[PDB]
């Protein structure tokens, strides 16, 4: 099982003066860190969010980001000044950074940047570059950001070395939470007819839900989207279009790893 580590940053710029930056960190589908604009420090959302880093190692790492948040805010504001009246507020910047882990000690790091909801910039190798589809005016910010050798070397170290090491540590410290097994609970309902089989409170995400009459699997079964619960579990519903009168005989069978063979069969 491969785990993707994600550092999701969202920055809003309403005008020349007003600005805010909020960050969230995910390991798989579980949140590990929170960093609100109001907060001066990065907050742990798990007891094991520090990973295998020592206190001295974390303070130094947080401080680097603390300076970055202030720096990033000023730099974007100055980059708008370089374009104006080419580009204008409101401006939304999104950053998706981190690394995906693989069997053994293999990994792949990424740093993806979005402008106004569109993916335009990435850090690749030793420099910043635009992706296919990006507008040409971005060549000036790219040339400016690449001139900063100090930022380049720092980002290279964060992606190549720091990310894999930190996640290898997170997987050890968070093994108990990452490998947790929460049992789903199911209930049935009907709407004007369409029958709905609700499944709630399961972890991990993979699940099998299907409407069945005995041993026959119904083809018209439509799975919804995986909806999250507040307690870090998942919710999913399956719908089936049927004629009125033939509701009797239909059952919802649910397979999940937590159940351990004993599938939840629910007749109507």
């Amino acid at each position, epitope marked *: 099982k491969n785990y993707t580590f994600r550092c999701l940053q969202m920055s809003s710029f309403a005008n020349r003066s007003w600005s805010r930056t909020d960050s969230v960190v995910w390991l798989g589908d579980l949140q590990t860190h929170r960093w609100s604009n109001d907060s001066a420090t990065i907050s742990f959302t798990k007891p094991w969010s520090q990973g295998k880093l020592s206190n001295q190692q974390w303070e130094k790492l947080q401080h680097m980001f603390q300076v970055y948040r202030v720096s990033f805010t000023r730099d974007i504001q100055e980059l708008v000044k370089m374009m104006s009246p080419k580009e204008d507020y409101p401006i939304e910047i999104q950053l998706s950074a981190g690394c995906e882990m693989y069997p053994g000690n293999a990994s792949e790091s990424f740093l993806h940047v979005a402008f106004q909801g569109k993916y335009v910039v990435r850090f690749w190798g030793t420099s910043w570059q635009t992706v296919p589809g990006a507008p040409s005016w971005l060549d000036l910010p790219i040339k400016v950001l*690449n*001139a900063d050798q100090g930022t380049s070397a720092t980002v290279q170290m964060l992606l190549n070395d720091t990310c894999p090491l930190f996640v290898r540590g997170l997987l050890e410290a968070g093994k108990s939470d990452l490998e947790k097994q929460e049992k789903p609970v199911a209930w049935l309902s009907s709407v004007p007819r369409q029958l709905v089989c609700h499944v709630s409170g399961f972890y991990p995400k993979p699940v099998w839900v299907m409407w069945m009459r005995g041993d026959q699997e119904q083809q018209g079964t439509h799975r919804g989207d995986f909806l999250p619960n507040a307690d870090e579990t998942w919710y999913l519903q399956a719908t089936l279009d049927v004629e009125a009168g033939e509701e009797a005989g239909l059952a919802c069978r649910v397979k999940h790893s937590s159940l351990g063979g004993q599938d939840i069969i629910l007749y109507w």
Partner: T-cell receptor
Amino acid sequence: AAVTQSPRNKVAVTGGKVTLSCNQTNNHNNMYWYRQDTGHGLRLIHYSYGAGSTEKGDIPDGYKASRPSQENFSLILELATPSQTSVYFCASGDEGYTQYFGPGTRLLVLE
Amino acid sequence: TQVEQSPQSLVVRQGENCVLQCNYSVTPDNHLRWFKQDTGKGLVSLTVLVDQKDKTSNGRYSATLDKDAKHSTLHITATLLDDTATYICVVGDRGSALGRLHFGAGTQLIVIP
């Protein structure tokens, strides 16, 4: 990379119009205006990232900036005041952090 | 004033060595630059320090930088008359044009011939 300033020395009256010009033939996108006063370091007045663009610095009050072309960057004093008696340094640079400074302009505003 | 220089003024005899201190609170600290300015003249770049623990030299001028202590020294070996000048410390907060230069008030050196 060479930067020039005109005039090099100016004696003006209070209320008069003073225009401090700066020329740069290095094809630098970015130009900067500073003033030097005893007991202080150089302080940013105005700056520019390109033609037709001017940006407020740390102490912009009493000054207006003008950039009609890539090569010229002008600091304008519409209503000159004795408090604007200073040595004015112009600078230029490309994407890099290096700012190449001009020779400086002495200004005295008399009552 | 995030960049402070010591001493304010300095009187030294020809041939003698002198050290010039610079202390800053600029964040972040990309590079530190030492300028030489003659009474009247413009700003002449002597050296630029870039590393966490950096050391540079330019003939009779030599400089160190400690980014952990946020502190720099300018050593002038065997001072000549032409060293009579104001020496200015400058810290840049970026490695690009997005940076702002933070200037010190300067250190006034007088060399007795």
